[PDB]
Design a protein around this ligand. Structure first.
Ligand SMILES: O=c1[nH]cnc2c1ncn2[C@@H]1O[C@H](CO)[C@@H](O)[C@H]1O
Ligand SMILES: O=c1[nH]cnc2c1ncn2[C@@H]1O[C@H](CO)[C@@H](O)[C@H]1O
Length: 289
């Protein structure tokens, strides 16, 4: 199969440089494209066509077999409706139609525009299957059972956990290896699948100081993403460690629903060090790419 996709030539619809930039930004922040390289992202963007909708339009309707398209929303929102009940809200940058393309099933839920207008970029099934889907199902299988047992993700439903899985890769560390170094940009969030880590801050004299430990099910790296600064501690493996790793460019999409659970670092006594870093102004800015 992978050898056959090599022979597939995606369609191209003329794009200005500004349109390519716009679409590429949507794709590089949407989890469905997480592991495509830069050349492939550009081919996929070139294959997309613009579509627009009005309030109350159905982009697709439950039961349809005639869609078979992937829509990435530029702007506007849409309700996901099952059995007449609104169950999810799709917003800018998100995709609709991916469930049907990934799992080869008729449309599962109605997608109904709920803003005045919606603008989307649309990809055909063949380009999705040949260039995008890749190992999506295997990747979901690698992580889903684990994610279902991670405390800070307990509020996400299955759909949201699978969306997070789409953006995860694995990295292992031997004892004494640094997962995060102090003073770095801060673009990786790690969820500990196995092992123990130590958080090493800097004290008032600038010397390393042990802050706390984390272990299986804990996360590190989110503080820089929440508060837009460079890293303020090292994180060092104290045992062999296995992590699932999420890039900052996917954080808003995958973990949006828990952005608040994560702000509760303020209350945790384990984050006294960090709160003092923020209070004293000891970190410089860093924003998502
Ligand atoms: O449970 C869900 N949560 C969020 N979105 C969903 C869910 N089921 C479907 N969709 C979305 O609606 C489209 C049409 O079925 C799917 O492709 C997916 O984007
Ligand atoms: O005070 C703290 N308590 C617990 N973890 C911390 C604290 N400060 C930093 N980190 C952790 O180290 C990473 C890099 O700065 C942060 O993202 C967070 O996971």
């Amino acid at each position: 199969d992978p050898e056959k996709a090599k022979l597939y030539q995606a369609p191209y619809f003329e794009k200005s440089e500004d349109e390519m930039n716009l679409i590429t930004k949507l794709l590089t922040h949407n989890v469905l494209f997480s592991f495509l390289n830069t050349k492939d992202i550009k081919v996929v963007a070139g294959a997309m066509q613009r579509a627009t909708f009005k309030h109350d339009d159905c982009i697709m309707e439950a039961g349809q077999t005639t869609c078979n398209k992937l829509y990435i929303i530029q702007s506007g929102h849409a309700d996901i409706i099952k059995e007449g009940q609104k169950v999810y809200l799709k917003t800018e940058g998100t995709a609709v139609g991916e469930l049907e393309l990934m799992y080869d099933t008729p449309v599962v839920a109605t997608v109904k525009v709920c803003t005045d207008e919606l603008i989307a970029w649309v990809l055909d099934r063949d380009t999705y299957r040949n260039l995008v889907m890749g190992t999506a199902i295997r990747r979901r299988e690698t992580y889903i059972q684990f994610l279902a047992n991670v405390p800070f993700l307990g509020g996400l439903d299955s759909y949201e956990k699978l969306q997070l899985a789409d953006a995860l890769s694995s990295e292992e560390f031997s004892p004494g290896e640094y997962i995060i170094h102090y003073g770095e940009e801060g673009e990786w969030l790690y969820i500990i699948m196995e092992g123990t880590v130590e958080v090493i801050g800097r004290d008032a004299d600038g010397e390393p100081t042990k802050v706390c430990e984390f272990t299986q099910g804990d996360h590190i790296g989110e503080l820089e993403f929440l508060n837009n600064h460079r890293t303020v501690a090292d994180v060092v493996a104290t045992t062999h460690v296995i992590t699932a790793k999420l890039n900052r460019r996917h954080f808003e999409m995958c973990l949006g629903p828990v952005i608040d659970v994560l702000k509760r670092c303020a209350d945790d006594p384990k984050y006294e060090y960090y709160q003092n870093v923020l209070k004293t102004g000891a970190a410089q800015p860093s924003y998502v790419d």
